[model samples]
Every structure is written in structure tokens, then in C-alpha cells.
Target chain A: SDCYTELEKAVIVLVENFYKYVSKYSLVKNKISKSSFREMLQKELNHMLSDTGNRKAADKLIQNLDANHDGRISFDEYWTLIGGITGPIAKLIHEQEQQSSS
Target chain B: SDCYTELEKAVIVLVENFYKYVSKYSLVKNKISKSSFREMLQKELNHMLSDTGNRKAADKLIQNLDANHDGRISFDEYWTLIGGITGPIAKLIHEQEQQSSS
Candidate 1:
């Protein structure tokens, strides 16, 4: 019934977050351009990605993410931020757990 | 500003969700065994995943996911469920978009 669960909400958030940026500058429908993606990381992901506010760092990060350097982020590549970034900011989660009752 | 945005919440939800399942029966921290992952998919992801409630289906699904058949889901592999399942349930996202204002 998870049109109805936290996991479901989280998944859709990732999907919608993709289109939120992709809709702005999609040279191809499902792929987000490098510029669009870099800004997304900075604005939407600044805290977790930590170095995203640094233009060059975000650039280098997206460069690595673009993998084949196609200059766009596909659904797979974009979603990689979800799974992939988990490790990048894991201790925040642990920290939050320390205050799980707060 | 997003220790604090929908995207940040989404990312943290995924990490916390990982530990939620892993914390239950972890022979090793951060890895979820096949049985645990299977139940997680069925219980938490039934809607998005489509066939998760079917026991044998879940079994075969994990078989593929176990990739190297290590018998447990590493954080990387478990996170694959996030990116990987996106395509499988994409039409739902599109459907929701059609009703964006709803």
C-alpha cells in the first residue's frame, strides 16, 4: 500500500526532483544537461554534497557522475545521486540517530 | 540551506531506511541479508515494485540482485534498488505528472 510509505515518498521525490531540473533545460527529454545538474547539486543538494557550492567542485563531481561525459545526466545517472550520495553523507544520518528522540 | 529541503529529506530517508532494515539482522553492519531485503521490498515497496509480495518472485529477484551471490545486499547493491527500480516504476511518475496539480 505504498502509494503510502516513507520509502515510496522518497522514491517519488527523487523522480520529481529530476524533472524539476530537467524541465528547465532538457535538450533531450529525460536527460539533464551538465549545467542544469550542477546547479541542482548546488541548490538542492548543497548540504549533503557538502562541496556543491563550489562551482568547480560541483563541476568535477558532475563530470565524474556523467560517466561517459555525454554532457547530460540520464535517469540512471541522476538517480545515482540518491544511492551514491548516501555514503557521502552517512554520518549525518548517524548523528540524527543520536537524536532520534529529539 | 538544506540541511533542509525536500531533496535532502529524500536522501536522508534512503539512508535511514537502509539502516532500518539492516539493523535488524546484520551479520555485518550496513549489509542486509537476502531475506531481510526481500521482506523490505515486499512490505515497504509493494506498490512501486509491483511483484514484491509474491514470495518466489522476491526470491528470484534477490537472486539477480545478489549479483556475485554474496547472499547479502551491500549498501551499494541495496542502493541499486533505488536507481534500478526507478525505471521499473517510471510510468507511475509520469502518471502523477499528468495530474501534477492534484
Candidate 2:
């Protein structure tokens, strides 16, 4: 009963990654700090994401993504970023599959 | 440059799984049909999801998830579902990690 399908496991992995960046020393218990967000981008997402190493650019992206303007990344905000990135990649893959099938 | 971290790969897997069930024969071309969504639930999500085998239940779930009021599920709507499921599990895992670390 403990066995998880790949899909379920992927979901868990994505969620865990979000918590991985949340600061333990911060006043906010479960939210990610701006610096932590930049570190997460550089360490975990440099390959798939542009501007990972650019602090100014990363801060700009975070400003746009911070839905509540709280200067921190909530779980929901983090998920919005994930969905944003995944949407286009899904479209690209869908197009490739269609092209090959046709 | 071809390297993808585990997190990036996980995102890719989730998106690809969505397209795996989208109907090629349908006029919509890139959307998942109701029946295909049912099959996706049973085969890919039965473990993490309840009511997968229940036709009425799955239909109701899809109805709530279809944000555009369209009968078919779109990529954005699908991402919303993923975000919804992942959010709760993320909280669970975050609490567990905190308990152990403290």
C-alpha cells in the first residue's frame, strides 16, 4: 500500500522541493525568503531556468511572482511558478509528439 | 547542458503524463476527453486518488476541475489540479520534516 506510482511520486518530489527552500531562522515559518529563493534557483534550477545566477533578475521575477506582495514566497506562489514553467514545456512536447505522429 | 536536476525532471514527467492521455482522435486535438480522464485516473492516479474507479465520482471531480466550463480538460486546468493536490501533501511533508528536525 505504500507504493506510489511515478505520477504520485513526482508530485511529492515537487512539494518537497518547495519546503527545501523555506528558511528555518526566519519569522515566517513556512515561507521562502528572497535570498533562499535565489539560492534555490541557482542550486536546483540553473539548468532549466534562465537568470538563476542574476540576483537582480531573480528579484525581479520574484516581485512579479509574489502574488500577495509579502516579499516572501508562499507555497501557492511557488506552485504558480512551477505551473508557469511546466505549461510551456508541456506545449512544446505536445507539439513534438504531434509532429512525429503525423 | 543536457543535464536536468531531479526537480526539473519531475516537473517534466508530470507534464508529459498529462499529454499521454489527451485524445489524438478528437476534434480538439490537445485536450483530454472525459473517458480518457477516467482512464488516467484509474491507471495513473488510482493510488493517490480516491473514487478513480467510480464513474460518477470522477465525472464530478472533473466538473469541479474544468475551470473554463468546457467539457474537456485544458493544460492550465490540469496544472491547477496538480497544484491543489501537491499543496496539501507539501504541508504534510513540511510538518513531518519540522517535527523530526526539531
Candidate 3:
């Protein structure tokens, strides 16, 4: 068990902070393009999941968010869906850590 | 300088802490044992080096440590070498970040 696991809350906090920066950061200049966003998500997911190949998971997620089966999701849609998912996932992580600790 | 430039001290602290854990933890439950202390010495070396394929440097360093030319360096020997490396590298990071901030 993590002596002090902050990841469950930190993910939500990070996504919230991302909102404060998104408008200030241009998707092109900040290199927050599709590919960069994919890499950023993959890096965080790998850290959280402790898995080597979370890229496939990131791809699947991006695809799922592009609900029309199109190749892209708009920023608003992406943000909304991710915000919705983070709550339950964070709870699951918190519960898992609690179970492992006790 | 970071508002909290703890890493210069933290690396050494982490290695020392790892020592405490290694004795407390079973090598089996740790399940992530190196083939030899030399192997893990090399892994830590590459992590310290932070370049693509610094594994080559790690291999060379391990060869140097195995004074009798045995493939495996003993635990105490490897740990001492890593402790020595951590000092200068951590200082370098501290210096670089100081430069970046100014």
C-alpha cells in the first residue's frame, strides 16, 4: 500500500488545472495537438496504471470519445467526458488502495 | 531554484530508504529482483544517465565495478557505487535548475 497515495485526487486536480490553462495555451503553439495530447494522456495513464503499453488504452479512449466514430472529438466534448469519468475512477482507486491497506 | 529543491537531498534519502525497505521486504514478494545486484546497479545507472540507450554506459560501469571480472557485483559494492554517483548527479540537477530559474 502507498504510505500516502495522492494519485486518486491528483488526477482530478490535474484535469481541473488543465482547464485553467487550456484557453491560455494554444493547441498549436503549446503543441497541444492531437498527437501531443495523446502522449500527455498516455504518460499520465502509464504512471497511474503502472503499465508499459497504455498507449493502446489512450487510443481506445480517444476513439470512444469520438462517439460518431469519427477520428476526433471537440475540446468541449473531450473535457466533459473526461471530467465525468475521473470521478468514478478516482473512487475506484481510493477504494482499491483502502482495501489493500487493510 | 525550485521553491523546494529537495531532490539533491531526496535522491540520497531515497537510496537510504531503499536500503531499509530491501531488508524489510522479501526478495520474492518484491518479485522485481534484478538478476544480480550488478543488473540493478546498471538499471539505476541508466536512470541516472537519462539518455537513450545509456544502458551501454551502465554495462561499462558495471564491468568496472566487478573488479574480479565476475559478472555480478556484490550488494555492498554496488550500493556504494550508486551512492557515490547520486551525489554529483543530484548536485548537477540542482545547478541546472538554478540556471533555468535565473
Candidate 4:
């Protein structure tokens, strides 16, 4: 039962985490800076993200996101990033579930 | 430091939660049925979703989402719903922060 509430809290935490990274000085209010986003990757997402400490890789990843060529990550763009991370993990989870059940 | 791992786990948990509701009986592999999604709302998201038990309200909300006329929720559509819930809460948090800082 608590897990039901726990999941809801987790969703909100994910949302607030994005807001926490959004810079106040940007011309756009809600967008996060490339550096801020990188820091988020390092500090908050290092467990799941592959190259959190490599600036060159992180920089290239940021620059490579065609949707984020502007060097700032929008909310929707942030969601896409989360999706990218979640996708591979989802596969692993499904695979584990399959292996365990078999 | 562990917050980094904690946050990453939370993100994955959100992703898996969606997968948990995705009915194997669904014609589509990754989409959730109306009933399953409603149950998710009732159980996993009761705290954030206002009318988790009100089928009439839930039905109307689902119908009003111009994006999901198919009566099932896709992953992208699920992200959008999370955004909707997060946005209002973000404003409330910001307002409270502003109030305290003054």
C-alpha cells in the first residue's frame, strides 16, 4: 500500500529534480544550461548514465542531441533524455524478469 | 552522494511502473489499457491524482485528452500526464519559496 504512495512520490521527485537544475539566469525560465545538465548527469544520474565524468563525452552528447542544438535543455527535451536512459534499463529489467520466470 | 544513486533508481522505477501496468493482453506491446491505467491512478498515484476512485471523472479526463482517443495510454502520453501533474506542483513550490525569501 505504501508502495502506491511511494510511486507517486517518486514521480513528483523526478519532476522536481528537473526544476532544481533549471537555471535562474537563462533568458528562458525553465530551460537548464548545458553545464547544469551535465552536473545533473554527474551528481544525480551517475548511477545510470555511462559517461558522467567525461566532459568530452558529455559535451558531445549534449551537442549531438539535434533537438537541443540550442545548448539548453527544455522540459520536453529533458523528458526525452530520461526516456533514453530508461529504455535500456527497461530492457534489462524485462530480460531479468524473463530469466527469473523461466 | 547516495542521492545520485537514489535519484537514478527513482527514474528507473517510474519507467518500470509504466511497464508494470502495460497489459500483456493489449494488442500493442507497450500501451496500457484504460482499466489498467485507471487502476494505476487509483493505486500507484492516488496521492497526486485527485479523483483516483471516481470513474466518471477518470473517464472524462481520459476522453478529454485529445491525444489519446484510442482509450489506451502510450509512454509518451504518460510522460505528458506526469508533466501536467508536475507543473501545478512546481508553481506551488515556487510560490512558497518566493514567499519565504521575501
In the range A4-76, model 2's lDDT, one tens digit per residue, is 6767666666666666665553544655565666567667665554443434544555656765667666555
Chain A vs. true chain A, TM-score per candidate?
0.65, 0.58, 0.44, 0.55
> Model 3 clash pairs?
none
What is the lDDT of every predicted structure here? 0.62, 0.58, 0.38, 0.55
Q: Rank candidates by TM-score, best first.
A: 1, 2, 4, 3
Residues A1-102 of candidate 3 have per-residue lDDT tens digits of 222122211222333324423434455233234555565455334333335453454455555664464433343344433333333233334343335431
Leading candidate by lDDT: 1
Comparing 2 and 4 on DockQ, the stronger one: 2
Q: Name the candidate, 1 or 2, with the larger DockQ value.
A: 1
- Model 1 misplaced regions, further than 4 Å: A1-3, A27-31, A49-61, A67-72, B1-3, B26-31, B51-61, B69-72
Q: How well is each residue in A1-102 modelled by candidate 1, as lDDT tens digits?
A: 224576777777788867667665554355556665666666776656554243454455456776575655566677654455566466676567557631
Model 4 lDDT per residue over B1-102, tens place: 223355665665566666666645454455555665656666665555445343454455555563456765555566655544455445553443345431
lDDT winner, 1 or 2: 1
True contacts kept of each: 0.47, 0.50, 0.00, 0.34
Q: Worst lDDT window (10 residues) for model 4 chain A?
A: A93-102
- Where in model 4 is the C-alpha error above 4 Å? A1-4, A23-31, A51-77, A93-102, B1-4, B23-31, B51-77, B93-102
TM-score of chain A of 4: 0.55
**Ten consecutive residues with minimal summed lDDT in candidate 2 chain B?**
B49-58
